[PDB]
């Protein structure tokens, strides 16, 4: 007698339940799906084939070793489907996880997935939901920014990178975006900011929440970083498949040509 | 240099600066452990590195660090030091820290207490000097009633009196008294000044001495009464009542005179029973007459100059003496050997008042040490830091040689191998001095920077010919620049033809003069026309290394290039002196007629708050000194906090920003004239 | 001038506080060939530093940060003017050199309704980009996802020193302590472990970040060795028309 088939059961039913109920439900309160629902609506019914779900942080560091703080898959889902039959490969970020704080695990799965599509010729979306690096991590966050920027750079040019920010995303992985072709917000619920407020208050000495420091707003008004803003995440996804039909595969493939009336 | 003979295995030396550097020389030639106290600054010092142990003492200033007793108590409980060196300075005269080490074990290289408060005042020194027999000050003891006492005294000893007002406190004053007119009416000037400076209005009137010199004699002795005289010592050439160059065996006298002097000296000593090496200082007139003059109970700081022409370590001579030893000499076992000469190379500009304190961080430091016969004693090392807080004394450089004129010569040529970049010296001063007719000649006094340079230093005048070697040279220099920026490596896709120019015809700006100047090149020898004078020139041309050595007729110079930019300005030092030089071409200089001059506007005063801020702690006060871009204050900010200079140098006059204040951007802080 | 000087002058350029601040054109005098350096725009952006050089009579372009000007942190212009010179460079096979003191990026308002993040990539992908032969070397600090876009390893960097006074940390003591140590409370102590442990360049070290740690006076007689060693360097990326720059 083995326990190897329950313990695949218990590892699937971790990573579909994420890290608890009770932040599935904090999710949802905010009026914020989650990340397997967001690639469900955005790829088409039955094409996604996810990969790498067996994946965990390697850290034992200031009782991160605990059971409790491991999780498979940490807190992001990758992998590849097929948009009106053409196809592509997405990331998602799971803000249950420590926030979506990116670790040696987190940034390996992007870098792999990257150079798949890379190396097959197909377009890359990013749906960004992170509150930053890791700390307890150290310098295995800063190296996984530097592997995915240096990625996102070699990529550029070659195939079409677009991102699409749903949550409040802070630090180095506001670069990332910064990178691609194509940025997208979500209205009253993304954020982009280097720094928090807290930090413009202790030393400009000014008073400023996130609404008018880092919104959807001020970004797609008076900023320039971002390309267009939607209401919540559904016109967002619906609106994301409707202009990924507009774009080419790769460099290598010619503008695409539809059937005319 | 024996080792077997037993002696204290730990030393603490409680000084800075080349003294300790030199004690912790000696005691490693010793084979004795040496501890070493430093300030917060002076961690990464050549002295605390030189040693084995260091302990800190304390904050930057030296009223907290180096004359602090607790921080050397405790130094001393936790090292558990068996002797104590203090060098000199700081507390080398201080009875309580005397007898405070003295107290419960530890020994204290130096002389006792009693001796340090018969000579701690200039009274009683004086008084014990005449008890012992010796040729005193030409005065009288009292003190002066009316202008009758005055002419009496003055009738009394000597026609050519001072009226100065000694005693009290310091005892200076520009007086004579040589007429009895004179005597009266300076006696109520100097009764007045007296009142006014310290109100003692009573005199010890003393006879005026002409153009005296200033010699010393240094004396060793241990506790069996034992004394020797090491030959004299010459320090004339004073400039704010300091000495900058110093010659051992003195020239004005013989040896009749100096056996006197040193007899004198001997007995002066075992009347106050001195046990260590000390100096006894006179002035000496022209009719070959010595008056005693103050006694240094502690080791002289030009006492290397007096080592060399006797070959007697007086560090190793003083350790073996407080250890108990008796001396190992006997008087005639003393020899005159050769000849010594000693300059001092301060941080200070010898444009101003002949030295201002200045400051900065050295960027390169290099000593002549490969040059025959030449002996450099520096506590600084490249990346040194010379701060406010401590003298600003760089180094001290020593030259022995058969007679005067080729000690005289090897100086000369150290100084023109001698590389400070970073801070500025007055390595041109010592160069100007140690040629000039009157010293070599030998007649000087404590006057002769007052007379020389009555309107002060303006730096070494050039004659016709050294102008001419100078244009020759600055063009040679400048023709090797410009032919060695043509060498590039191949190409083999577009060729480089080479120009094959044959002459360069430059026009070169000095001072306020224009030359024309004709310069050829063949191979490693330029010939150099300047005003039809014709000229060679042949070096190495190395254009890398700080000192270029070239021979212009034969004769050998040495040259550095301080400054060059690409419009034509350069600054050389040469024979010690830098100077400013712009070179052009012909046809630029031509051109740069119809150039417009810029002409300047507003006042220097600039200085204001490069951004808001606040300012945690302000330390100027209106009429303080101020130093060559000394650091003015202190604004801190976010993380890094700033600190702004005095690059300009100006009296204080108001200090519109105060402490604290949140003064915004182009806001007035310090007004500087 | 050789290729082997020493250069003691920089044992101890870079004080014990980490308050006080040095200026880093003092190091790039002591490092090239002849202590000359010819500077692009001197007083525009000041906190950073960019310039030709010449480093055994090959010609290379310095970049390096700036700590007297307000403390060294990059803003918009910076940005822009690191990021066209390193392109420039790279475009006729120049080599690099980098100086890192960062501490992160200025913090305000003016600057995120500006547009800071793009700029920052512009720098980043100015540094990924290069194909030329880069050396990099790290005298105090480096912070944050500043110290990914000043060229760290991760981006193809070829070799990369640090001074011993150098450290390489994620945030600040103090931030680290509070974001991670909450509910504990007690930062009399965490603090002095986490700043005796993780306030040194050795958990960079231990992972191979850093080539090696190396004495500052021979910082020169590093550098040359290298750049005689990456002359030849050649390296191949994916065919495409031209990328797509943040500008
Ligand atoms: C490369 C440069 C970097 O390292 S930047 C890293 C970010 N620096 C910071 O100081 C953290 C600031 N971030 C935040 O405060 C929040 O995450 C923000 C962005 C405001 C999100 O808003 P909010 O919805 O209120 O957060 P939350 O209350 O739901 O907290 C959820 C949990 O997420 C965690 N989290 C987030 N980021 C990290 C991180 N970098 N490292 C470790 N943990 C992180 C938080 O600990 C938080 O935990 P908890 O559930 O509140 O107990
Ligand atoms: N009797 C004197 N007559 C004229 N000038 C004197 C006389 N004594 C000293 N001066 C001057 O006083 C100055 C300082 O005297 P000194 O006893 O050496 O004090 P210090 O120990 O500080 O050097 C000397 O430069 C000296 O030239
Ligand atoms: C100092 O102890 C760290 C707290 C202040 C951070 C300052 S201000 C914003 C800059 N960004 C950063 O990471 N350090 C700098
Ligand atoms: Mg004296």
Not at chain 2, 290 to 308: A, D, G, I, K
Not at chain 3, 201 to 226: E, N
């Amino acid at each position: 007698a083995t326990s190897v088939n329950e313990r695949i059961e218990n590892k699937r039913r971790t990573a579909l339940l994420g890290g608890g109920q009770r932040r599935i439900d904090a999710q949802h309160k905010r009026g914020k799906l989650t990340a397997r629902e967001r690639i469900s609506l955005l790829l088409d019914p039955g094409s996604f084939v996810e990969s790498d779900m067996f994946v965990e942080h390697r850290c034992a560091d200031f009782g991160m070793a605990a059971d409790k703080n491991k999780f498979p898959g940490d807190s992001v889902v990758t992998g590849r489907g097929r948009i009106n039959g053409r196809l592509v490969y997405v990331f998602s970020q799971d803000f249950t996880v420590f926030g979506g704080s990116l670790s040696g695990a987190h940034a390996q799965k992007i870098c792999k997935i990257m150079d798949q599509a890379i190396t097959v010729g197909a377009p890359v979306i990013g749906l960004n939901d992170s509150g930053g690096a890791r700390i307890q991590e150290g310098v295995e966050s800063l190296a996984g920014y530097a592997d995915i920027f240096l990625r996102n750079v070699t990529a550029s040019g070659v195939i079409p990178q677009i991102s699409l920010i749903m949550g409040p995303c802070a630090g180095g992985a506001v670069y990332s975006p910064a990178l691609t072709d194509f940025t997208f917000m979500v209205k009253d619920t993304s954020y982009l900011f280097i720094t928090g407020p807290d930090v413009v208050k202790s030393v400009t000495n000014e008073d400023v929440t996130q609404e008018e420091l880092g919104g959807a707003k001020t970004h797609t008004t008076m900023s320039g970083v971002a390309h267009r803003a939607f209401e919540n995440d559904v016109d967002a996804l619906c609106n994301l498949r409707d202009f990924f039909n507009y774009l080419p595969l790769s460099s290598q493939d010619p503008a695409p040509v539809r059937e005319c009336h | 240099y024996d080792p077997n003979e037993k002696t204290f295995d730990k030393i603490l030396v409680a000084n800075r600066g080349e003294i300790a550097c030199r004690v912790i020389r000696t005691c490693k030639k010793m084979g004795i452990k040496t501890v070493a106290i430093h300030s917060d600054v002076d961690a990464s010092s050549v002295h605390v590195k030189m040693a084995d142990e260091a302990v800190c003492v304390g904050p930057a200033p030296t009223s907290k660090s180096y004359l602090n007793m607790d921080a050397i108590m405790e130094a001393i409980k936790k090292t558990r030091a068996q002797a104590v060196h203090p060098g000199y300075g700081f507390l080398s005269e201080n009875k309580e820290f005397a007898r405070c080490l003295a107290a419960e074990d530890v020994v204290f290289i130096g002389p006792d207490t009693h001796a340090i408060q018969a000579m701690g005042d200039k009274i009683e020194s004086k008084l014990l000097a005449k008890k012992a027999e010796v040729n005193t000050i030409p005065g009288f003891d009292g003190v002066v009633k009316d202008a009758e006492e005055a002419v009496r005294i003055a009738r009394e000893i000597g026609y050519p009196v001072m009226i100065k007002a000694s005693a009290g406190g310091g005892g200076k004053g520009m007086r004579i008294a040589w007429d009895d007119e004179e005597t009266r009416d300076g006696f109520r000037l100097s009764s007045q000044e007296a009142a006014s400076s310290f109100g003692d209005d009573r005199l010890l009137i003393e006879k005026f001495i002409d153009n005296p010199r200033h010699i010393e004699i240094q004396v060793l002795g241990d506790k069996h009464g034992n004394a020797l005289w090491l030959n004299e010592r010459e320090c004339s050439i004073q400039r704010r009542n300091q000495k900058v160059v110093e010659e051992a065996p003195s020239i004005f006298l013989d040896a009749e005179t100096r056996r006197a002097m040193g007899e004198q000296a001997v007995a002066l000593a075992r009347a106050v029973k001195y046990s260590s090496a000390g100096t006894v200082e006179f002035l000496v007139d022209s009719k070959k007459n010595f008056y005693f003059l103050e006694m240094n109970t502690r080791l002289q700081v030009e006492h290397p100059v007096t080592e060399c022409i006797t070959g007697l370590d007086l560090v190793q001579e003083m350790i073996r003496v407080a250890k108990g030893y008796p001396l190992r000499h006997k008087q005639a076992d003393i020899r005159i050997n050769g000849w010594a000469v000693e300059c001092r190379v301060y941080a200070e500009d010898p444009y101003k008042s002949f030295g201002l304190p200045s400051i900065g961080r050295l960027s390169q430091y290099q000593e002549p040490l490969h040059l025959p016969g030449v002996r450099v004693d520096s506590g600084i090392q490249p990346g040194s830091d010379i701060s406010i807080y401590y003298d600003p004394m760089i180094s001290k450089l020593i030259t022995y040689g058969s007679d005067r004129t080729e000690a005289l010569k090897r100086m000369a040529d150290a100084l023109d191998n001698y590389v400070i970049r970073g801070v500025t010296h007055n390595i041109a001063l010592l160069r100007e001095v140690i040629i000039n007719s009157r010293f070599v000649k030998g007649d000087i006094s404590t006057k002769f920077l007052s007379d020389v340079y009555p309107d002060g230093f303006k730096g070494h005048m050039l004659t016709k010919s050294e102008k001419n070697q100078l244009l020759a040279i600055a063009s040679s220099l400048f023709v090797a620049f410009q032919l060695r920026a043509q060498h590039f490596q191949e190409n083999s896709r577009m060729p480089v033809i080479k120009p094959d120019i044959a002459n360069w015809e430059l026009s070169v700006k000095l001072h306020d003069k224009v030359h024309t100047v004709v310069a050829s090149n063949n191979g490693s020898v330029f010939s150099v026309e300047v005003d039809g004078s014709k000229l060679n020139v042949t070096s190495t041309w190395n254009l890398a290394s700080p000192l270029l050595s070239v021979s212009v007729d034969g004769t050998q110079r040495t040259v550095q290039c301080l400054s060059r930019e690409a419009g034509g300005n350069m600054s050389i030092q040469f024979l010690g002196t830098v100077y400013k030089v712009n070179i052009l071409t012909r046809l630029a200089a031509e051109l740069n007629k119809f150039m417009l001059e810029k002409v300047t506007e507003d006042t220097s005063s600039v200085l204001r708050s490069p951004m808001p801020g606040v300012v945690v702690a302000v330390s100027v006060k209106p009429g303080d000194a101020v130093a060559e871009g000394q650091e003015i204050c202190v604004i801190e900010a976010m993380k890094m906090q700033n600190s702004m200079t005095a690059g300009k140098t100006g009296t204080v006059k108001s200090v519109h920003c105060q402490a604290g204040d949140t003064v915004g951007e182009g806001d007035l802080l310090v007004e500087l004239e | 001038d050789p290729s082997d000087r020493l250069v003691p002058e920089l044992d101890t350029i870079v004080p014990l506080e980490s308050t006080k601040a040095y200026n880093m054109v003092d190091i790039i005098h002591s490092v090239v060939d002849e202590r000359e350096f010819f500077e692009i725009m001197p007083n525009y952006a000041k906190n950073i530093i960019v310039g030709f050089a010449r480093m055994n009579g090959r010609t290379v372009g310095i970049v390096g940060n700036q700590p007297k000007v307000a403390s060294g942190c990059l803003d918009i212009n910076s940005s822009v003017k690191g990021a066209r010179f390193v392109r420039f460079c790279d475009a006729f096979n120049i080599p690099l050199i980098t100086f890192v003191d960062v501490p992160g990026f200025l913090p305000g308002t003016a600057q995120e309704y500006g547009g800071i993040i793009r700029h920052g990539a512009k720098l980043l992908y100015a540094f990924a980009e290069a194909t030329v032969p880069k050396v990099t070397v790290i005298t105090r600090k480096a912070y944050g996802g500043a110290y990914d876009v000043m060229s760290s390893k991760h981006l193809c960097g070829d070799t990369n020193y640090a001074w011993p006074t150098a450290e390489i940390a994620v945030m600040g003591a103090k931030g680290a302590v509070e974001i991670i140590f909450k509910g504990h409370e007690n930062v009399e102590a965490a603090q002095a472990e986490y700043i005796e442990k993780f306030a040194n360049p050795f958990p960079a070290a231990v992972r191979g970040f850093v080539d090696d740690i190396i004495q500052p006076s021979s910082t020169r007689a590093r550098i040359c060795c290298d750049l005689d060693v990456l002359a030849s360097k050649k390296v191949q990326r994916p065919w495409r028309k031209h990328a797509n720059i943040p500008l």
